[PDB]
């Protein structure tokens, strides 16, 4: 009685475009074109697909199948699979928090640009502003200029001294105080996700119609726009020129694996939640297949969208697009790409749809990000919770604002990197490995093939079987070992992070991980019996 059976989605296309909305984000736009053109160019497509087929797709489809089959949250599903690994559901809840502290501040920057892009003369065109230094040298100014080590462009000056105000902080040590503009921007973001999540899957699923389709439109406008620019073939040459020798490096495969994993994002509980609210009779194999193939191809065309404008920018400057595309991160889109689109007709248009496109890219993904955690807590503490959804949703949203207050600082950008590199990647890889191993090895991949066989009507192929049993946990294990062995020294804006950052990072990387061995200790520590007896009753799910 009472609630009993769970709710169901409003249409097939909503959940298709919804999982597509989670899959597609900023990184699809600029991360993949950079990592592609840097690691052997077009040849990077060869391992990228392999790491997709053997790694990303199986985790994606396994996660999705479990989600639609068991209809449980990220915490409650472990109660009915492997209770000792229930802490996994908790770990994600912490991980997501760390992500929601920086991912939306980027959307706040794109939002600050968007509202600052309504003026007839764009701010980052002239140097006669209140934030530019004496180094600021700009165009529509005398030709022959010969750039100096200390000179700075109006776009770099605008991004550095205004929207970030990063010159007012010395690094991780001193980063305060808070830029209230980005606080209001990210507040508006938390509002626009508040009215798109608070109701549940119906609103996220309806806002997704806009948040997942518009990026293709803006990418299409900047695509046909960037294609008509003179000398844009340079960026395409640098973008797709095959350099097969780079394929001999054992690093490149690692980069491809990490890319496809962190662009499909399986085992994060978001796909579990998005899959939970669907029909048991409804097919999901085709769903997972098509959805991934969209995320990959969308990245492929996004490469052109970026490197066409970068090619035109390298033509107006002096070629070897790599030099104009050295820095990967927020500067490739907020400085180089913005300064590139500044010299184009009706620049207000392309600017508005560009930064609006950035916000539109982050919105759907963060919808899904929150959706997974919300589903997990509501399903884990029912009746004690579900009293209202706006209460718990409001709680997690304002929590994400207070979490971003460290990021809204002057040196917030610094923290963004520290959180983007150190915290998420190793832990997420770990929980994906433990999750995959627990579904494929503990629960038994045989019974999983029986669950899919009861789901779609047919048992999954021997390919999916061997991928889940061996190829996928080895796929995650690869990136785990390669990551731990060579953690990266990182620098941003002529500032090398202190030696101790990794320590801090490891804290932020493990402070979220402590819950699973301590929960195994809590489960095995709480029920008396013998060690062999209690772990045998704790590995087998509920019989009824």
């Amino acid at each position: 009685g009472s609630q009993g059976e769970r709710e169901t989605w409003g249409k097939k296309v909503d959940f298709l475009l919804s999982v597509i909305g989670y899959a597609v984000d900023l990184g699809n736009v600029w991360r993949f074109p950079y990592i592609c053109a840097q690691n052997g160019g077009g040849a990077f497509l060869l391992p990228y697909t392999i790491m997709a087929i053997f790694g990303g797709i199986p985790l994606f489809y396994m996660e999705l199948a479990l989600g639609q089959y068991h209809r449980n949250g990220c915490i409650s599903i472990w109660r009915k699979i492997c209770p000792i690994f229930k802490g996994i559901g908790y770990a994600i809840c912490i991980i997501a928090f760390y992500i929601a502290s920086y991912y939306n501040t980027i959307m706040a920057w794109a939002l600050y640009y968007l509202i600052s892009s309504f003026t007839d003369q764009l701010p980052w065109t002239s140097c006669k502003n209140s934030w530019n230094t004496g180094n600021c040298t700009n165009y529509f100014s005398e030709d022959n200029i010969t750039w100096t080590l200390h000179s700075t462009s109006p776009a770099e000056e605008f991004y550095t001294r205004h929207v970030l105000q990063i010159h007012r902080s010395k690094g991780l040590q001193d980063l305060g105080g808070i830029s209230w503009q980005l606080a209001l921007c990210i507040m508006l973001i938390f509002t626009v996700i508040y009215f798109s999540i608070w109701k549940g899957v119906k609103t996220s699923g309806k806002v997704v119609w806009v948040t997942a389709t518009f990026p293709y439109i803006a990418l299409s406008v900047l695509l046909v726009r960037g294609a008509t620019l003179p000398g844009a073939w340079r960026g395409v040459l640098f973008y797709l020129k095959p350099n097969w020798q780079k394929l001999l490096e054992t690093g490149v495969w690692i980069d491809a694996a990490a890319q496809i994993f962190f662009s499909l994002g399986p085992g994060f509980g978001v796909l579990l939640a998005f899959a939970s609210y669907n029909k048991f009779n409804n097919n999901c194999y085709q769903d997972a297949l098509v959805t991934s193939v969209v995320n990959c191809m969308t990245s492929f065309v996004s490469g052109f969208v970026i490197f066409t404008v970068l090619g035109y920018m390298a033509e107006m400057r002096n070629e070897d697009v790599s030099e104009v595309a050295k820095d990967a991160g927020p500067s490739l889109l907020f400085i180089t790409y913005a300064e590139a689109i500044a010299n184009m007709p009706a620049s207000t248009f392309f600017a508005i749809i560009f930064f609006l496109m950035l916000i539109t890219l982050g919105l759907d993904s963060t919808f899904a990000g929150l959706e997974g955690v919300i589903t997990a807590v509501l399903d884990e503490f029912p009746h004690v919770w579900a009293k209202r959804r706006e209460r718990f949703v409001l709680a997690v949203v304002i929590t994400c604002f207070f979490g971003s207050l460290v990021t809204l600082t002057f040196g917030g950008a610094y923290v963004v990197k520290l959180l983007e590199e150190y915290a998420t990647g190793p832990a997420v890889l770990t929980v994906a490995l433990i999750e995959a191993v627990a579904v494929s090895w503990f629960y038994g991949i045989t019974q999983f093939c029986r669950d899919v066989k009861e789901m779609l009507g047919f048992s999954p192929g021997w390919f999916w079987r061997i991928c889940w049993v061996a190829i996928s946990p080895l796929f995650l294990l690869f990136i785990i070992a390669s990551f731990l062995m060579s953690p990266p020294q990182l620098r941003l804006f002529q500032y090398n992070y202190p030696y101790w950052s990794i320590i801090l990072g490891y804290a932020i990387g493990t402070s979220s991980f402590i819950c699973i061995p301590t929960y195994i200790a809590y489960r095995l520590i709480i029920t008396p019996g013998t060690f062999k007896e209690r772990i045998i009753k704790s590995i087998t799910p509920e019989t009824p």
Epitope: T148, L149, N318, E319, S322
Partner: antibody, heavy 119, light 108 residues
Framework: EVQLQQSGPELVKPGASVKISCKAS????????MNWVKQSHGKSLEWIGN????????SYNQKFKGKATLTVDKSSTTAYMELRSLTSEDSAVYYC????????????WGQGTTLTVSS | DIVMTQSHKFMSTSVGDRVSITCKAS??????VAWYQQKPGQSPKLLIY???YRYTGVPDRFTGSGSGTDFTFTISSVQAEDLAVYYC?????????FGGGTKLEIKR
């Protein structure tokens, strides 16, 4: 005006090391990249690498990686290039030349440094 | 990398004649070629940058042209002191490479 006074000629036995100076003057030293070009007898110019005087930002050439080491000192506005594992091919004239960051031309050069690697 | 090829190692000209040295690059360069003048016994002296622009302190008799891959250095009034070895160098892709060097010998 702008002057790049290099060091005198050096006669060094093969297998040893040799350091060449480059006293820069006449401009804001921290405003320009400091480059090193190699010129073999009867050969063309060969770009060794550059250095950012502010933080010692050395950007070398794959052909000279581990062959040359560029350093810089702001307290005296002087850039140095050290060479190890000296052979008969290194017996060439070396120049230190100033360059902006873009466009990357070599506006002012030094008088050259005659290096002879022989026992 | 980039290979700057000066096919003609030597070029003969006379005082007052119109002389032009060619320069072939590996790939497309747009307008990123600088011409240097190394007089026998002196350091290379910068004459042209970015294909056509002249550098400061260079007489009007030195000009530059070309757009794409092949570029040309022109002297209208050759003087007795214009006797030198001319090099061409690209300035877009890392690393920066030079030409083989064209010695300009004067005929009398």
């Amino acid at each position: 005006e702008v002057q790049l006074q290099q060091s005198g000629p050096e006669l060094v036995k093969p297998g040893a090391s040799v350091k060449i100076s480059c006293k820069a003057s006449g401009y804001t030293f921290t405003d320009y990249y400091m480059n090193w070009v190699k010129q073999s007898h009867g050969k063309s110019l060969e770009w060794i690498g550059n250095i950012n005087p502010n933080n010692g930002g050395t950007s070398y050439n794959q052909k000279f990686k581990g062959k040359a080491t560029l350093t810089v000192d702001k307290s005296s506005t002087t850039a140095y290039m050290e060479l190890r594992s000296l052979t008969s091919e290194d017996s060439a004239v070396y120049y230190c030349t100033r360059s902006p960051v873009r466009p990357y031309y070599f506006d002012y050069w030094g008088q050259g440094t005659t290096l002879t690697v022989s026992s | 990398d980039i290979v700057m090829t000066q096919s003609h190692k030597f070029m003969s000209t006379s005082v007052g004649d119109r002389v032009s040295i060619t320069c072939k690059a590996s790939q497309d360069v747009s307008t990123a070629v600088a011409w240097y003048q190394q007089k026998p016994g002196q350091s290379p002296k910068l004459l042209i940058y970015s294909a056509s622009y002249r550098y400061t302190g260079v007489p009007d008799r030195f000009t530059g042209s070309g757009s794409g891959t092949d570029f040309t250095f022109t002297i209208s009034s050759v003087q007795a002191e214009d006797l030198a070895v001319y090099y061409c160098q690209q300035h877009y892709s890392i690393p920066r490479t030079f030409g083989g060097g064209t010695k300009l010998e004067i005929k009398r």
